[PDB]
């Protein structure tokens, strides 16, 4: 909805790091749903065919993930699960551009970036913005942000949480315990013939 | 460590799955129409043009069968700043004129009007409801004195999409969406078995 | 199995040569010995960054062992010899050439 009028002109960048991130991308998800009783395959044909033609494989280059979402009873919802899995793993530009200023700029805003040494001349969505005093840097992440080890850890963490919370009755009778906290200080003063102690415990 | 945890999680994730379950399939397919904007104001080309997010959404909503954009006005203005996808209105509108519609070929539509206005910095196509479809800007103000403004919209396949194509008929349909000209909107889906490579024809 | 290639680029021209999944081969020759194809793979990451004025392109590529790794056994080889199992698994579940 928002555009930042003060773009990153060729004179206004001073560092960049712009990849295409395709490390984690796959082309087939099979989702088991109902009580593990029915299944759906989400099928990226393009990526499978491209890997075949590229590598010279005898058959389409399947790379697969298996998920079980056993509370899902709707097939079209199970499709969405798998689609979402593919979409969030896809190859994307996810570059850093380093500039100055742009205090008004937020994630979700659009900005024009021109970097002639890189052949960039585009309007991009800001995924993240970082401000550094001292070095006086504004660091724009454009298009998308991906994690590193934290992406692996969060994907595992969510999976563990999902499996842990299976079989929990969510309409179960609630109970409550209140954590409360109070303290008394005992001060000690010791006096011997009008002389105070130097330390007391 | 991560591999062992991941391998463990996957095993527990898939534990209840019936591997003889009924199997179902969803195919992920992808195509795009590029619409190209040319603006001619009394023999001067615009230095920049944007097919705005409102215009993209107008074509999107029309493709679902909601209704075609009713292109009515060429609007001119006095502000070349802040050109973006996100523009919903001209920077500073000075004059508005009713369009004549021409269809030079399949895949192209022209909107033109005769206009008198000094200091034209920006030009736009506007629907009856006030939805901006394009904004174009000039580096230097143009003085129009009974000069013809022409906005040309050209439809093309995005040749960057692998193993999918919008046909000539599909590109004609997108043109007909823009031109209010009874488009052959999506009503059906087909599957086949010939593997001969995709072409527009 | 992986390869990393480091190249100089101008106006991002070389970055465009390496879309994800594109074929990359590395050949080696020492002295006057004929070229050996030492790595075949596909691009997984293209990265271009500012390195003290230089425009540095890293291409990262994976190889064929990915297909055995990112695939699962579909049918059950209970009551098969390991021979019969290998045939079944490779021919049904992997995109690679089987030769008994």
């Amino acid at each position: 909805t928002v555009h930042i009028d003060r773009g990153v002109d060729n004179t206004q960048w001073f560092r960049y790091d712009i990849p295409e991130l395709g490390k984690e991308a796959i082309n087939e998800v099979e989702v088991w749903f109902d009580d593990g009783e029915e299944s759906v395959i989400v099928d990226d044909g393009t990526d499978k065919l491209d890997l075949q033609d590229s590598l010279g494989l005898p058959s389409p280059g399947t790379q697969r993930k298996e998920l079980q979402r056993p509370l899902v009873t709707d097939i079209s919802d199970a499709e969405d699960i798998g689609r979402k899995y593919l979409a969030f793993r896809n190859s994307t530009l996810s570059g850093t551009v380093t500039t100055y200023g742009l205090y008004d700029a937020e994630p979700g805003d659009t900005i024009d970036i021109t970097i002639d040494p890189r052949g960039i001349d585009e309007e991009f969505v800001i995924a993240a913005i970082e401000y550094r005093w001292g070095v006086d840097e504004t660091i724009l992440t454009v298009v998308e942000k991906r994690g590193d080890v934290d992406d692996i850890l969060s994907e595992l963490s969510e999976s563990v949480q999902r499996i842990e919370m299976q079989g929990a009755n969510r309409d179960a009778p609630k109970n409550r315990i209140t954590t409360t906290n109070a303290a008394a200080i005992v001060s000690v003063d010791v006096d011997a013939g009008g002389t105070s102690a130097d330390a007391d415990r | 460590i991560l591999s062992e945890l991941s391998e463990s999680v996957q095993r527990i994730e898939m534990q209840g799955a019936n591997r003889d379950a009924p199997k179902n399939r969803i195919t992920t397919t992808n195509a795009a129409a590029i619409v190209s904007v040319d603006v001619d104001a009394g023999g001067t080309s615009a230095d920049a043009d944007r097919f705005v997010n409102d215009g993209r959404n107008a074509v999107r909503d029309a493709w679902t069968g909601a209704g075609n954009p009713d292109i009515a006005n060429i609007v001119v203005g006095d502000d070349n700043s802040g050109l973006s996808r996100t523009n919903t209105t001209l920077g500073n509108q000075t004059d508005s004129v009713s369009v004549t519609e021409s269809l030079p070929s399949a895949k192209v539509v022209e909107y033109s009007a005769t206009l008198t206005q000094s200091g034209v910095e920006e030009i736009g196509l506007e629907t009856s409801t006030g939805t901006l479809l394009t904004r174009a800007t000039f580096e230097t103000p143009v003085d129009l004195s009974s000069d013809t403004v022409t906005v040309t919209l050209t439809v093309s396949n995005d040749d960057s999409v692998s193993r999918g194509v919008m046909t000539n008929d599909g590109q004609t349909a997108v043109r007909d969406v823009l031109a209010d000209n009874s488009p052959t909107l999506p009503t059906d889906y087909g599957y086949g078995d010939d593997s001969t490579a995709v072409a527009e024809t | 199995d992986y390869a990393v290639f480091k190249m100089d680029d101008r106006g991002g021209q070389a970055f465009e040569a390496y879309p994800r999944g594109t074929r990359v081969e590395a050949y080696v020759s020492e002295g006057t010995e004929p070229l050996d194809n030492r790595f075949t793979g596909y691009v997984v990451e293209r990265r271009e960054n500012e390195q003290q004025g230089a425009d540095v392109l890293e291409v990262e590529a994976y190889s064929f062992d990915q297909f055995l790794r990112r695939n699962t056994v579909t049918n059950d080889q209970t009551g098969n010899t390991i021979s019969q199992a290998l045939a079944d698994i490779i021919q049904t579940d992997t995109p690679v050439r089987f030769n008994a």
Binding site: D148 | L2, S6 | -
Partner: peptide, 25 residues
């Protein structure tokens, strides 16, 4: 020579995760 721990850890993240990406997840 004063070294920034956030800078090192944030810069090396790409390389720390790569062995895992090579192996699936």
């Amino acid at each position: 020579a004063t070294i920034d721990g956030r800078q090192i850890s944030e810069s090396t993240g790409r390389y720390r995760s790569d062995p895992s990406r090579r192996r699936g997840i």
